[PDB]
Amino acid sequence: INFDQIFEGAIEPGKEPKRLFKEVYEGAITATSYAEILLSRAIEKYGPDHPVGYPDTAYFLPVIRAFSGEEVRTLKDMVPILNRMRAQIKSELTFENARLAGEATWYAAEIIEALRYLKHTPENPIVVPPWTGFIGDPVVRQYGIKMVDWTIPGEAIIIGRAKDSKAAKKIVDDLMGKGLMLFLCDEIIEQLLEENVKLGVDYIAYPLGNFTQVVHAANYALRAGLMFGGIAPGLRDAHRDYQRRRVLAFVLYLGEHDMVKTAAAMGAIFTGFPVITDQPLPEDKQIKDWFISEPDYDKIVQTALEVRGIKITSIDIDLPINFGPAFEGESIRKGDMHVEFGGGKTPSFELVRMVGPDEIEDGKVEVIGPDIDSVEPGGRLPIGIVVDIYGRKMQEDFEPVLERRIHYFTNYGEGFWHTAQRDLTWVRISKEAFAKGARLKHLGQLLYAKFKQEFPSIVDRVQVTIYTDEQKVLELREIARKKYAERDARLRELSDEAVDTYYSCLLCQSFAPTHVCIVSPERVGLCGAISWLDAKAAYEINPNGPNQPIPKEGLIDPVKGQWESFNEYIYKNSQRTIERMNLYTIMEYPMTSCGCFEAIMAYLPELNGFMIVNREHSGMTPIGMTFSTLAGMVGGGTQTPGFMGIGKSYIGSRKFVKADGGLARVVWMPKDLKEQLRSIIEERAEEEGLGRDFIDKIADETVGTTVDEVLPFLEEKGHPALSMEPLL
Ligand code: SF4
Ligand code: NI
Ligand code: NI
Questions:
Q1: Residue 593 lies inside a defined structural domain of this protein
Q2: Domain range for 484
Q3: Is the CB of 596 under 6 A from ligand 1?
Q4: Which DSSP state fits 382?
Q5: What is the C-alpha separation between 197 and 184, in angstroms, rounded?
Q6: 277 and 348 part of one domain
Q7: Annotated binding site for [4Fe-4S] cluster
Q8: CA-CA to 32 of 20 to 30 Å: which in 5, 146, 502, 700?
Q9: Using CA atoms in the order 270, 577, 598, 423, what is the torsion angle rounded to 10 degrees?
Q10: Whose CA is nearest to atom 1 of ligand 1?
């Protein structure tokens, strides 16, 4: 693993910018000398075994814990590290020696900052607000994942000062508006606050501080690899490689270049973060794609995003209410609900159609009937949201992957809530909503907005049309049931045998690096949200995304369902920890799980079968553990023979753990789950020859929660698992 290959062909074997390399060198020798002298003093004053470190972190000095592994805990620990860093700052002016100096600079900085926290106490804090100083583990945990799974598209590390407040606020205002996270250091914090721009944790705008406090963006980043990436303390290139692929960070070096800022900017280069500066640079203080100037305060931003590789375009729905995903999961009781749509109360339905160009007015929204003001508070009312779409590269195929976005789109605005799916949607709007000026034409805005934002290469135009009239809802509730039955049709018709390509899913490698899902027609992804068609549309929409096609090639076991093609793909994408995967059994080489499984299956030899327990069930199961304890063992991308994480709908698949005996093998499941799947279990049990009433033979928590309490019931009912071969 030569991470450095990303630096090849960077600068011709001649144009080595001996300028930049001299600044970096001097500035690196400077940062180190500072750390050395300031450490020497901490030791004369506190003693060499005196403790040192950051508050609220499990990672000692993170940058160092990651790149070389030491767990700095006391002053004496910093001595051999500074010695080593010093010895690695070399005079030959190579891009390499430069990078190595940038690294020693992050170390010096990390040490200086920790040394500085020696005078910190929660009662007598050193860098008190607005600034953050060292940012704690809890926020990295909370926003770091959003960071490495790319929800937050990129990270901006701004060091120095902008040409003027207007200049700074301009960029930090849009950069910031484009959903990014910010690490600020130095002067711009001043400039920015001057202009009353609010920022901080809740805004993911980090006023770090000023000199060596820029290292606080590095140790934030590096902790993401130690926390989420699971990379062992000290795996240097693995950590660099991780920073590069997952942390979309770049630095904006605004203002005039001083040597240490430059050496630190270079430290961000050594770990794959590009530098984009204000100053116009000569050809010898520059690097194509790593250290570059773009003086027009109208470029920089767009130019960073671009050099990093950050791709995002924004939408602009001006509304009377708050908007974003953070307004999701908001509930709307009958004691705040202004109006209520759908439910088992009024006529609902939603649909996303595909139309030609000629027939659509991009941006044209329409509410046919009494809007939100034309109604009694705590009033019900029919609705019918039809999103008609047109696009060059659009497909009927993508319709479902789209429509799915309604619940999530609709839940973004504050004062709103959506539930269910098609003619089954339960919506609700809060008094607070209607209060700030919430009108039905706005659901048509939150909507057209997003669809155009989240599908920029297949969608060209979007037109929405709500429907609170009970006449119109029942007429276009039947045209759609035509779409839904032409749709839910497509699913049912697909089988494992009928296709010769399955789709992988790497989406959860953001929190479970070694986990790889394989999605096939008859086995939905364990999160229950990604079907084979879903994965297939996503790949097609994004051939470079985390959902790739894998042909069935190299048959190994036709019964357990093992193929070399899937095995190789998994081995390669699980950091080589998983070598084999059987699709139709949980007893040998079961597929792994991330942590979002809707349910857990576990073989219980005392009953010769499987218990299944769903995420929301909280009682004791016959294995002597609850869902969350099992979850701890089953998740994490590790192979667990005899346990397996699954989506609920897989329970009714004809391929359901087929090599193990299938449905007939299940002896216990929570009553609620059993009822929630009554129909599919009844039909499946019927086809399987288990009989119309097999469901009644499956024990549940009302029968018991221990194997001794459950066996009697299975005997009495003559459960079929009791007559099958043991699975051992
Ligand atoms: S659980 Fe599997 S299918 Fe679902 S998002 Fe995670 S990796 Fe993808
Ligand atoms: Ni998961
Ligand atoms: Ni998951």
A1: no
A2: 317-494
A3: yes
A4: -
A5: 13
A6: no
A7: 505, 508, 515, 517, 527, 596
A8: 5
A9: 70
A10: 527
